[PDB]
RNA sequence: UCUACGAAGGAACGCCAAAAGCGAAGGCAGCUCUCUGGGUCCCUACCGACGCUGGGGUGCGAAAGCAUGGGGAGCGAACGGGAUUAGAUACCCUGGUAGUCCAUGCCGUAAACGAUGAGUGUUCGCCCUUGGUCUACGCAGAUCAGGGGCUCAGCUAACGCGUGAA
């Protein structure tokens, strides 16, 4: 969907949920810079704000 | 092949299920019907 | 060091409760010279997973938000809280671009 | 992954199911590092060479995108 | 110059960069560059005499092709004109192939001529004349191996070791007209010349 | 509603499935050895597992539930979980009626989510 | 030597006799240009900044910006009525193709 | 003329003393307790 | 609005005030902070700072120390012979001492 | 055994993820915070030749090893048995302490391996790509720092490199 440009920067926050719980897949994993169309500053910042939040208990673990 | 030997074992579930031969699998000519598939 | 702490709390039980435990550091940060903004709360939230499986209360925490800013060992105060009751996830982090 | 058999269907079922969790990479991983044990260098080793089957592999894709 | 006008609008000077030389390249074009028109004229002016010069010797010739987009542009001449060999402008119809120019007295006697052409001809051709993009590359190779000058057709598509050894390049640059007459100038050339 | 599990372990040279209530209470259990002549050398297949599922489909049966989430939770290719599916299935029904399936289905294999330094190699 | 001097000093040194494209090799050199760098300007036609903006609008254009360049040294902001001359041009010249 | 980046730092740190700290909706700590004011958005 | 100064002295984790404090004392002309005693006295604040809250294990930023002091050795070793009456005024000003 | 919930602990940090990144080298990753080194981009301001290398010397320097005090889940030298063999100190299985881990100290070595000292200038391109910058008008074009392939040439006994092995 449209979750896919810079806006994410914007929008990607462990206080937040939607916009990133848009990211963990089906089985509780990350998915890669080419799942989605998203940069590499991009996802490294999406990996430590998912890893916050899981470990703040706030996300899915499985 | 295939249906051969997949329709061969689960006939044999008789062999299996059935103290060793009661043929109720009498049944068990469409196996040979695909079988004789050339 | 303009700190946003989130306090991911224990069940709705006690109302006029978590109210004092965070006026503590509002009187905390009114001493040592610290600076308050907003104190915005959140309500329930459905946390991911069952935590502190101690006590249980896993599902449908409460959230609110201190937004502060002061001095550094502030941190190495807020070891005072980890061990408190209906705060489960005390996170004091920064100052974001997000809202 | 979850999944209720839609009025004993079973077999689309399990399309789905695996079709879904096969995609979302965790297959990739129940099969991928399970094994006995490997150290820092055997890992490496082994990163080097699923670079060198990937870059081989593309190179007969690009080779056959006509 | 009306001359460059016709060269211009024979969408000639413009091809895509692929290129080792520069010595031509009036500038580019996000597409295209522009060679030197003039200097592609000059070139003309340069080949097109040593090959009318030649004929005062009547040197055999042997021009060369494989893209048979100008097959019926060339084939109205080396035959009845230049070579004069209609049945051998039929092996350059199906030539370059083989043992080559080197080995050309070679046996290739084996035919079994079932939808098969085999001509092998056999003289030393004096001067070499090409055009096509790279198959033919075993003539480059074997002029240059035995002194036979050449004049070949040459894009900005050229690795050294043919742009270096061919003299005379013609850097004509087949570009977006494809294939068009040219070879009519050659046409003009060792006919109503050799008196 | 209010249902079983049937849940089946996979492992390097046995298998066990144990038919228990949604509060995990040990009910018909069956080892992959708890059958004539399928353990020692017969340990290492996946025909163990086959007629693991069938027998306990069978008995399972026997015991009418019909009802029963059943889940996996082993280290294989979906091609062994599929064929022991299909088994339970077919031990389960092909002495009933031609359609006796399950209420459900679902899958759990836990990954160790970090190290805790597995053995070292053959040789 | 080079393929043109190294046979002449050849055959003038006497190491093989003459070859039969010699004197017409001579009298037509090959088409030497000066020796240049590198560095193959980007050549560029004057009214770029706008055809790549007006295309996307609505060829003649990518020419007409001449015609507009002309007057183009007290040019204050012309596009607008450089676009209206286009739109003129085309809803006679359509007007004339629709009758045709 | 870097005088002019001078005067151009020194404004940008003015701001106004940044007036996003300066303004009036600020938070006294001794208070009524925003906290406490807090019941709207206490479920929010 | 009176919590204007209750943003200070605690608010702070930089202290680089210090630097242009200093930098000042020791500044010429005005944007002027490239000097060498400059630099010297920036070195010499940041060995005084830097002394004082690392562990004897933060061992790759003790080098950076080491780095730094050296450095300043040089920029003395410079200062020394090209405007020393400015190089007495250093050392008094700045506590370092001469060693040819 | 298994099967659900618990408790105890230890140990490493799943996915991200990466021929990605950071470091002088050895090396470095679950997260958050304080303190902290070096870097690049950037109109560019100053400053002014202060640079490069570096004998004897000075620090850092994985693993194992040592010392003293912790801890010891799993792994697991030594060793025990099951084995296996003509024989078996072994490979195969099951046990299993020292060790791994933390605190501080000692060593000061590794295929410490791009098997490529350090630095400066000049060099045909293309493909990428990490992070900066300028310019943008359907979209990129440019410019820097790096990391990675492929090449013109050049070199090489041969392979090959071409951020050089020019």
């Not at chain 5, 004929?55 to 084939?75: Q, Y």
């Not at chain 5, 070949?152 to 294939?179: C, G, H, M, Q, W």
Request: net charge positive.
């Amino acid at each position: 969907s449209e979750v896919t440009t810079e806006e994410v920067l914007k929008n990607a926050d462990f206080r937040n949920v939607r916009f990133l719980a848009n990211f963990i897949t089906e089985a509780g994993i990350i998915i890669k810079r080419k799942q989605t169309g998203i940069s590499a500053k991009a996802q490294r910042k999406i990996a430590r704000e998912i890893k916050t939040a899981r470990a703040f208990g706030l996300m899915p673990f499985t | 092949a295939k249906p051969c030997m997949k329709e061969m074992v689960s006939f044999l579930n008789c062999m299996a299920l059935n103290n060793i031969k009661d043929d109720k699998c009498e049944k068990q000519k469409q196996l040979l019907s695909v079988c004789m598939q050339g | 060091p303009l700190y946003d702490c989130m306090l991911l709390f224990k069940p709705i039980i006690r109302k006029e409760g978590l109210i004092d435990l965070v006026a503590r550091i509002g009187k905390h940060v009114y001493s040592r010279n610290g600076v308050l903004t907003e104190i915005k709360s959140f309500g329930k939230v459905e946390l991911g997973y069952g935590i502190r499986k101690l006590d249980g209360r896993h599902y449908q925490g409460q959230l609110m938000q201190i937004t502060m800013m002061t001095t550094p060992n502030m941190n190495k105060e807020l070891h005072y809280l980890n061990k408190e009751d209906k705060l489960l996830r005390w996170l004091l982090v920064k100052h974001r671009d997000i809202k | 992954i979850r999944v209720k058999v839609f009025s004993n269907d079973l077999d689309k079922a399990l399309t789905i199911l695996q079709k879904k969790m096969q995609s979302s990479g965790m297959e990739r991983l129940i099969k991928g590092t399970q094994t006995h044990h490997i150290k820092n260098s055997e890992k490496k080793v082994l990163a080097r060479k699923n670079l060198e089957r990937r870059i081989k592999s593309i190179d007969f894709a690009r080779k056959l995108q006509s | 110059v009306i001359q460059k006008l016709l060269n211009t609008g024979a969408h000639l000077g413009r091809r895509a960069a692929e290129h080792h030389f520069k010595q031509y390249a009036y500038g580019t074009r996000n597409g295209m560059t522009i060679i030197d028109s003039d200097k592609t004229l000059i070139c003309l002016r340069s080949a097109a005499h040593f090959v009318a010069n030649l004929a005062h010797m009547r040197g055999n010739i042997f021009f060369v092709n494989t893209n048979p987009l100008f097959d019926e542009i060339i084939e109205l001449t080396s035959r009845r004109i230049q070579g004069d060999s209609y049945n051998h402008n039929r092996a350059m119809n199906l030539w370059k192939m083989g043992g080559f120019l080197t080995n050309s007295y070679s046996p290739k006697k084996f035919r079994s001529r079932h939808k098969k052409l085999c001509f092998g001809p056999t003289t030393m051709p004096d001067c070499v004349v090409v055009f096509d993009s790279e198959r033919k590359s075993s003539v480059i190779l074997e002029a240059s191996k035995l002194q036979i000058p050449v004049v070949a057709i040459v894009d900005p598509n050229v690795p050294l070791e043919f742009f270096e050894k061919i003299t005379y390049p013609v850097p004509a640059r087949d570009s977006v007209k494809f294939v068009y007459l040219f070879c009519n100038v050659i046409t003009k050339c060792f006919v109503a010349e050799q008196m | 509603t209010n249902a079983d599990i049937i849940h089946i372990k996979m492992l390097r040279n046995n298998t066990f499935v144990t038919v228990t209530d949604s509060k995990g209470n040990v009910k018909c259990k069956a080892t992959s050895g708890s059958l004539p002549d399928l353990k020692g050398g017969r340990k290492m297949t996946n025909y163990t597992a086959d007629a693991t599922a069938e027998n306990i489909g069978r008995r399972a049966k026997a015991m009418g539930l019909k009802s029963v989430v059943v889940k996996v939770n082993g280290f294989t290719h979906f091609g062994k979980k599929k064929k022991a599916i299909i088994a339970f299935r077919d031990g389960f029904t092909n002495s009933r009626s031609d359609q006796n399936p399950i209420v459900y289905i679902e899958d759990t294999t836990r990954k160790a989510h970090n190290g805790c330094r597995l053995p070292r190699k053959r040789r | 030597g080079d393929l043109l001097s190294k046979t002449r000093r050849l055959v003038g040194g006497l190491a093989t006799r003459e070859p039969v494209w010699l004197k017409a090799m001579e009298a037509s050199p090959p088409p030497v240009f000066p020796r240049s760098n590198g560095k193959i300007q980007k050549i560029v036609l004057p009214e770029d900044p706008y055809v790549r903006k007006f295309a996307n609008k609505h060829r003649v254009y990518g020419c007409r910006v001449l015609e507009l360049k002309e007057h183009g040294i007290s040019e204050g902001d012309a596009m607008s009525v450089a676009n209206m001359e286009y739109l003129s041009e085309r809803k006679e010249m359509k007007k004339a193709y629709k009758r045709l | 003329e870097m005088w002019k980046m001078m005067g151009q730092k020194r404004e940008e740190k003015i701001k106004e003393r940044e007036k996003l700290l300066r303004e009036q909706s600020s938070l006294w700590i001794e208070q009524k307790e925003l906290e406490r004011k807090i019941t709207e958005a206490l479920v929010d | 609005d009176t919590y204007f100064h209750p943003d200070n002295m605690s608010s702070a984790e930089k202290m680089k005030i210090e630097l242009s404090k200093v930098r000042e004392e020791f500044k010429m002309s005005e944007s002027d902070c490239g000097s060498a005693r400059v630099q010297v006295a920036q070195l010499t604040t940041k060995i005084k700072h830097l002394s004082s809250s690392l562990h004897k294990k933060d061992k790759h930023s003790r080098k950076g120390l080491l780095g730094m002091v050296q450095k300043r050795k040089k920029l003395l070793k410079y200062l020394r012979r090209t405007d020393w009456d400015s190089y007495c005024l250093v050392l008094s000003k700045l506590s370092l001492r001469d060693n040819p």
